[PDB]
């Protein structure tokens, strides 16, 4: 079990987004070009609009991997602030010390 249903949803959006990556890339290339004819670009427009939009990149949300919390995650540890702190304060996180200066 992933910890939440929200997680299942986003796991799947990751798998989707890896699936169609190159269709996206390829099609969008024409679409982003000023050298090509506009005519090509309209059809291609309809084409990326075609492919399932649960497979689009921006629809992805980094979460805390243990705790699932949608905000507060620190990119490097893929952890929520609460969980991160929790670990770092038993000393279980290497090289992280409470900062004084």
């Amino acid at each position: 079990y992933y910890v939440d249903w929200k997680m299942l949803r986003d796991v799947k959006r990751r798998k989707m987004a890896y699936e169609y990556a190159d269709e996206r890339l390829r099609i969008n290339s024409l679409r982003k070009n000023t050298i090509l004819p506009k005519d090509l670009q309209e059809v291609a427009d309809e084409e990326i609009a075609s492919l399932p939009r649960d497979s689009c990149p921006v629809r992805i949300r980094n979460r805390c991997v243990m705790t699932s919390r949608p905000r507060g995650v620190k990119r490097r540890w893929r952890l929520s602030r609460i969980v991160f702190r929790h670990l770092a304060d038993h000393g279980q996180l290497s090289g992280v010390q409470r900062a004084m200066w």
Binding site: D22, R26, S29, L30, I35, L36, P37, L40
Partner: protein, 103 residues
């Protein structure tokens, strides 16, 4: 049985479980036995295409893109190009209709 720790590590490494030393981070990845001119120089795959058209503009761009791309094998770079051949060749109609004659 293991007579010593050195013995241990030794058997691990012959086995492939330990790493080789000193480390080269490319160990275990041969990249198909390809060489630099099979990445950088993409003339091979542009042979079928209109040579004076904006199609050349575009595909010279894609060329430059895939020439600079470390994260892909030769087989994938190829696949991109062939996908563009297939794509442009699939729409002859739109090529003709935009004010340029395209092959």
């Amino acid at each position: 049985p293991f007579q010593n720790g050195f013995e241990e590590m030794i058997q691990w490494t012959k086995e492939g479980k330990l790493w080789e030393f000193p480390i080269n981070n490319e160990a275990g990845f041969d990249d198909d036995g390809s060489e630099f001119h099979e990445h950088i120089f993409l003339d091979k795959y542009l042979q079928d295409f209109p040579k004076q058209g904006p199609i050349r503009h575009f595909m010279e761009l894609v060329t430059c893109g895939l020439s600079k791309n470390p994260y892909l094998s030769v087989k994938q770079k190829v696949e991109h190009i062939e996908w563009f051949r297939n794509y442009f060749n699939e729409k002859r109609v739109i090529l003709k209709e935009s004010g340029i004659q395209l092959n």
